[PDB]
Design a protein around this ligand. Structure first.
Ligand SMILES: CCCCCCCC/C=C\CCCCCCCC(=O)OC[C@H](COP(=O)(O)OCC[N+](C)(C)C)OC(=O)CCCCCCC/C=C\CCCCCCCC
Ligand SMILES: CCCCCCCC/C=C\CCCCCCCC(=O)OC[C@H](COP(=O)(O)OCC[N+](C)(C)C)OC(=O)CCCCCCC/C=C\CCCCCCCC
Ligand SMILES: *[C@@H]1O[C@H](CO)[C@@H](O)[C@H](O)[C@H]1NC(C)=O
Ligand SMILES: *[C@@H]1O[C@H](CO)[C@@H](O)[C@H](O)[C@H]1NC(C)=O
Ligand SMILES: *[C@@H]1O[C@H](CO)[C@@H](O)[C@H](O)[C@H]1NC(C)=O
Lengths: 915, 203
């Protein structure tokens, strides 16, 4: 369907947050390379954010990169804690060779060449040393670290010619140095020197000139230096001849350069003394000489063109997040007159924290910044457009989202304004206004909804503390916000509290954040349309929060109430006005909380009182040694169901049990072994605490996937006795009659319904699963399945029916119940995402339109997707094929035929008269 | 009234078929005018009909004239072998252009819904009022176009008006005229007239 193919769907794809990178290909053709936290490898185009090839491997921590290296046309990657090694091509994404190593820790990696070429690469894993070939991969040789149990061998070097050095330190006793040499494998003389002042040389020091080590001793405020080739009992230079004091509580470090592993490193280098104090120095055999010192520098990089060797430096200017970047020539210190970039960030607290350089030979330079939040920028040496492109990689980990309706037109606003004689005159006035408007007639600030709204502004919140706002059609970030001091692991809940239906009253949404270490909690309230904090200040939570509900009852300003529960079992009601409080003092005893802790495996249920307190009402446990709760589900409050009954074959009726306050609980065993594994299901009422149903499915362990809709339930699992996935489905029916058909108080039903169920098989694995939705519940409901390959599948619920003939009678035949479909099938004619695959697909969101024939779908994983679905073929839109020309060529035909056969019968009749 | 429908449907599929049927019900009338023929059959039959009608009116209102005259003509008509009757011896177009068009429509405007009827209907009649839809869950008030067409047809019938053998026949007349009473029926008019007064007040 070309239209949906190109009008309403789209797919952004991200890589995450850069750890490593490598620029400066041969001239730099068009491209750069990264290697992120999310285990990805990408080959971006350095004129515009766009991808050539991803090679995402493994979410979980057995593909996490530990080093990276570019040999000028290719790359080298060391994954899985030293074990695996790969090389790629950097052109098409085409691997050329992969191998695996022994068990170790990967202390370090290097790239060695013997006298004039670079044939070999070296690996150090705290026990041994390996040396492999470049193109083949097949190992050349391994040697063993002399003692390899206390030294903590932490550094390799090779100054080009000949041989190799390996360096380790015991914390506060000494360091040992060793030399190997290629094509022997043999341990040349090793040296030992005592130095009880360092505790590491990982991020402290590095080789500078042709063997030379230099490491700092903040005690004695000096630099302990060593030629490493023709000297021991290491020398020392006191850093008092130069007014070059260290910091108080710092670990000062060293930054050398080595643009060629065949020629030695350069005799100029950098020191990081204080947070914001950097120094450039130069090393002669004994004469250290300062060329420059920078007091207000956050970041600096080295770089090298064909021959020249340069240093980029970053600085703040005075404030308003405005930074400047400059180039310096390393040999002298002389700044280069031109090449001052000045740029600025848009957010309030946000720091660069990282800088990479690419360099031309016109001489030009382009900079890459991985700023704090996760954002990425590519800056060019221009004046007017300085940001060549910007890439917002924080969306690679989304947590929870929502879809909000847009604001109103003027027409609808004044229309609401329109609504004894005052009534009549009001109506007249508004009518005359619209009239004058009609006669007269014949982006963030000018957008509003359309008929049968499909635009449905999106609000997504992110694990790094960055809120967005998107359009949901050609998704364009319209606004952003950043809320600070957010750990990696927290817990969010996103509540909508007033929408765009009351013109003068502005919308608002609400956000609850946990901290996960102290239990503290924070409440941030805002307006999802423009991205702004609201004027009303939220109350200050003292205690760790546990849970919250939304309670659609309103206040005199059309706002829901958002009850929150403390840890000392006390309630807080956010819009705490007098009106709401009297409403509550009236209707409190029809409000119940349910809480669940998986640690000890216990459930509890409380209720309110006239005042805001809680009296324990029901309580329930589960033994945590044979059952471990996995997840808990409850019906979406924002659904409406059409039919209370299912017409039977012979014009009879089977009524269905809904129970809004129901909830499903899923458990799995502890004694995991594929003969005695089992999965447990419980169906509970939230109010009383009585189990409707309590089921067990044996020989099944796997990660489960569940859906609990209006009166049906579905769960997917994995059978270890035929090594295959499976589906299981439940339905609840009370009977043939209705019991208080108008009220459904859950304190009045003795009789428990009859469960039907069934179990099918499925040919593949699963990721996030969801169900469609639309208000009024009319149209058929589908199941959206996320396969591992990234494709999505729409499955009709009516295919999963426990009441299926199973060698039909004639009733089932009439009821057209399609007996017991074997091996529920998979054909690629119902895949939404034809070539728009989503990689990880941790989740799916489904939202309702206003047209009742469409659902709005959003798939979130490592890469977003968005589209519309049509379960029943769009019965309320005209045909999307209409011929408007035939119909305007017909009416005129008839009108002229009518005039014709009017003037053509009057005449024949008159002539009949005067024959 | 729970659904929200495209207004383009109103524009481009509803009014066309409250128009088409109107102009076709007009054209049917005008063409029927242009179609009908009229024979010039014969002098004999027309004369015979005329005299039969004279007989009819004789039997009907031959009671305002002298008796002897009525009996004289009755004799000139009944008298054996002189009596005149004893000497002389010798839908589809409607329905079809309405049923052929519903088919065209339901072949053209098929895959969607048109409108709602405000009175609840019976369920068994659903599968033929919608005819494109694959919900089998809606109430049947929500219809297709064809039903709107047929409703219009039946509703606009009444609103065009507002804007616009020989010998045996002879013998049967004779037999029905044999039994006949003159009943002169004028024999008190004098008194009745001069009973209250003369009435005229418009001079
Ligand atoms: C709802 C829509 C249906 C009906 C609404 C009622 C109005 C009907 C008028 C339109 C019908 C029409 O066909 O209208 C023709 C007449 C022409 O005059 P007439 O000779 O038929 O007068 C009547 C005298 N009769 C009856 C002896 C001939 O227009 C008229 O009088 C009507 C004057 C319109 C006033 C504005
Ligand atoms: C727009 C142009 C309409 C063209 C149709 C038209 O002009 O002719 C049909 C009628 C007017 O003809 P008539 O009613 O005067 O009767 C004529 C018959 N005769 C002579 C016996 C009185 O159109 C109408 O009324 C329009 C009726 C509106 C319904 C749509
Ligand atoms: C902050 O930076 C923006 C960047 O365009 C600039 O327009 C604005 O003037 C700056 N703020 C101040 C106070 O100068
Ligand atoms: C139905 O429930 C309502 C509310 O609980 C109650 O007022 C009514 O009496 C009940 N009627 C029946 C027949 O159960
Ligand atoms: C996706 O595949 C379809 C055909 O399978 C093709 O027409 C379309 O161009 C593809 N999209 C991309 C972005 O390659």
């Amino acid at each position: 369907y070309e239209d949906q193919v190109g009008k309403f769907d789209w797919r952004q794809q991200y890589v995450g947050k850069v750890k490593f990178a490598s620029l400066e290909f041969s001239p730099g053709s068009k491209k750069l390379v990264v290697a992120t936290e999310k285990n990805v490898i990408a080959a971006l185009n350095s004129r515009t954010g766009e991808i050539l090839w991803r090679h995402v491997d493994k979410g979980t921590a057995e593909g996490a990169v530990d080093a990276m290296l570019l040999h000028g046309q290719d790359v080298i990657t060391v994954s899985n804690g030293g074990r695996i090694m790969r090389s790629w091509e950097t052109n098409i994404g085409g691997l050329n060779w992969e191998i695996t190593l022994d068990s170790g820790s990967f202390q370090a990696l290097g790239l060695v060449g013997l006298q004039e070429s670079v044939r070999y690469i070296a690996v150090l894993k705290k026990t041994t040393l390996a040396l492999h070939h470049l193109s083949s991969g097949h190992l050349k040789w391994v040697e063993h670290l002399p003692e390899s149990d206390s030294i903590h061998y932490q550094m390799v070097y090779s100054y080009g010619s000949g041989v190799v050095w390996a360096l380790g330190v015991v914390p506060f006793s000494h360091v040992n140095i060793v030399k190997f040499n290629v094509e022997d494998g043999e341990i040349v003389q090793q040296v030992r020197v005592s130095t009880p002042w360092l505790q590491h040389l990982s991020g402290a020091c590095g080789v500078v000139d042709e063997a030379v080590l230099v490491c700092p001793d903040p005690s004695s405020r000096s630099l302990q230096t060593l030629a490493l080739e023709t000297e021991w009992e290491l020398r020392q230079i006191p850093l008092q001849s130069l007014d070059l004091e260290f910091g108080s509580g710092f670990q000062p470090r060293v930054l050398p350069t080595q643009p060629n592993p065949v020629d030695a490193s350069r005799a100029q280098f950098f020191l990081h003394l204080s947070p914001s104090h950097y120094a450039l120095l130069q090393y002669h055999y004994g004469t250290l000489s300062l060329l420059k010192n920078f007091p207000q520098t956050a970041l600096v990089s080295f770089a090298t063109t064909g021959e020249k060797t340069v240093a980029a430096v970053m600085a703040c200017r005075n404030f308003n997040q405005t930074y400047t970047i400059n180039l310096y020539l390393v040999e002298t210190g002389r700044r280069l007159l031109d090449t001052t970039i000045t740029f600025s960030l848009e957010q309030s607290g946000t720091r660069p924290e990282r800088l990479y350089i690419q360099v031309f030979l016109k001489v030009g330079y382009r900079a890459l910044v991985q700023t704090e939040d996760h954002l990425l920028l590519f800056l060019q040496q221009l004046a007017g457009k300085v940001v060549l492109w910007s890439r917002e990689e924080s969306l690679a980990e989304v947590v929870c989202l929502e879809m909000v309706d847009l604001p109103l037109t003027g027409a609808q606003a004044e229309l609401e304004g329109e609504f004894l004689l005052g009534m009549f005159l009001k109506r007249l006035s508004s009518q005359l206004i619209l009239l004058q408007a009609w006669t007269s007639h014949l982006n963030i600030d000018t957008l509003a909804r359309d008929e049968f709204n499909l635009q449905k502004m999106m609000v997504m919140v992110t694990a790094s503390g960055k809120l967005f706002g998107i359009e949901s059609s050609s998704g364009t970030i319209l606004w952003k916000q950043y809320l600070p001091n957010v750990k990696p692991d927290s817990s969010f809940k996103l509540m909508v509290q007033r929408t765009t239906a009351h013109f003068p009253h502005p919308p608002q949404c609400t956000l609850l954040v946990k901290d996960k270490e102290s239990g503290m909690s924070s409440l941030y309230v805002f307006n999802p349309i423009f991205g702004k904090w609201s004027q009303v200040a939220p109350p200050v939570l003292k205690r760790p929060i546990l849970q919250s509900l939304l309670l659609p009852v309103m206040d005199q300003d059309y706002a829901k109430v958002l009850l929150l529960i403390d840890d000392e079992y006390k309630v807080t009601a956010f819009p705490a006005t007098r009106n709401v409080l009297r409403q509550l003092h009236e209707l409190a005893p029809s409000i119940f909380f349910y809480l669940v802790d998986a640690e000890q495996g216990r459930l509890c249920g409380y209720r309110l009182r006239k005042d805001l307190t809680t009296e324990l009402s029901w309580e329930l446990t589960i033994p945590p040694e044979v059952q471990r709760i996995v997840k808990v589900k409850g019906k979406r409050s924002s659904e409406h169901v059409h039919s209370q009954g299912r017409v039977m074959g012979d014009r009879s009726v089977l009524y269905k049990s809904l129970n809004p306050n129901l909830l499903a609980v899923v458990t799995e065993s502890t004694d995991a072994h594929h003969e005695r594994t089992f999965i447990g299901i419980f169906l509970i009422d939230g109010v009383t605490g009585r189990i409707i149903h309590s089921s067990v499915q044996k020989k099944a362990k796997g990660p489960v996937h569940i859906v609990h809709s209006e009166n049906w339930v579905v769960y997917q699992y994995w059978n270890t006795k035929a090594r295959r996935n499976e589906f299981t489905v439940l339905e609840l029916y009370e009977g043939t009659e209705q019991y208080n058909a108008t009220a459904f108080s859950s304190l009045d039903r003795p009789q428990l319904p009859q469960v039907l169920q069934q179990s099918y098989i499925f040919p593949s694995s699963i990721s996030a699963m969801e169900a469609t939705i639309t208000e009024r519940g009319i149209t058929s409901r589908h199941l959206l399945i996320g396969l591992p390959s990234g494709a999505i599948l729409s499955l009709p619920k009516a295919l999963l029916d426990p009441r299926r003939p199973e060698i039909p009678t004639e009733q089932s035949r009439e009821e057209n119940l399609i007996p017991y479909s074997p091996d529920v099938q998979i054909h690629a004619e119902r895949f939404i995402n034809y070539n728009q695959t989503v990689s990880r697909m941790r989740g799916i969101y489904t939202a309702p339109s206003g047209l009742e024939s469409t659902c709005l779908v959003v798939a979130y994983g490592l890469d977003i997707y968005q589209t519309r679905v049509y379960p029943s073929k769009q019965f309320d839109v005209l045909k999307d094929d209409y011929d408007y020309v035939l119909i305007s060529s017909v009416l005129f035909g008839l009108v002229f035929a009518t005039m014709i056969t009017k003037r053509l019968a009057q005449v024949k009749l008159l002539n009949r008269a005067w024959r | 009234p729970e659904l929200l429908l495209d207004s383009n449907i109103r524009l481009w599929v509803v009014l066309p078929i409250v128009i088409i049927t109107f102009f076709v019900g007009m054209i049917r009338h005008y063409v029927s005018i242009l179609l009908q023929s009229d024979k010039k059959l014969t002098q004999e039959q027309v004369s015979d009909s005329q005299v039969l009608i004279r007989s009819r009116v004789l039997r009907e209102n031959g009671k305002y004239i002298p008796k002897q005259s009525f009996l004289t003509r009755k004799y000139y008509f009944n008298n054996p072998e002189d009596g005149f009757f004893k000497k002389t011896k010798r839908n589809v177009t409607n329905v079809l252009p309405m049923i052929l068009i519903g088919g065209w429509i339901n072949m053209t405007f098929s895959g969607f819904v048109t409108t709602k009827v405000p009175f609840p209907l019976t369920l068994r009649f659903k599968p033929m009022l919608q005819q494109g839809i694959e919900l089998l869950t809606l109430d049947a008030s929500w219809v297709s176009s064809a039903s709107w067409y047929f409703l219009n047809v039946f509703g606009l019938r009444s609103i065009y008006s507002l804007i616009l053998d020989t010998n045996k026949a002879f013998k049967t007349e004779w037999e029905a005229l044999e039994l006949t009473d003159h009943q002169w029926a004028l024999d008190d008019v004098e008194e009745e007239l001069m009973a209250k007064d003369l009435h005229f007040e418009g001079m």
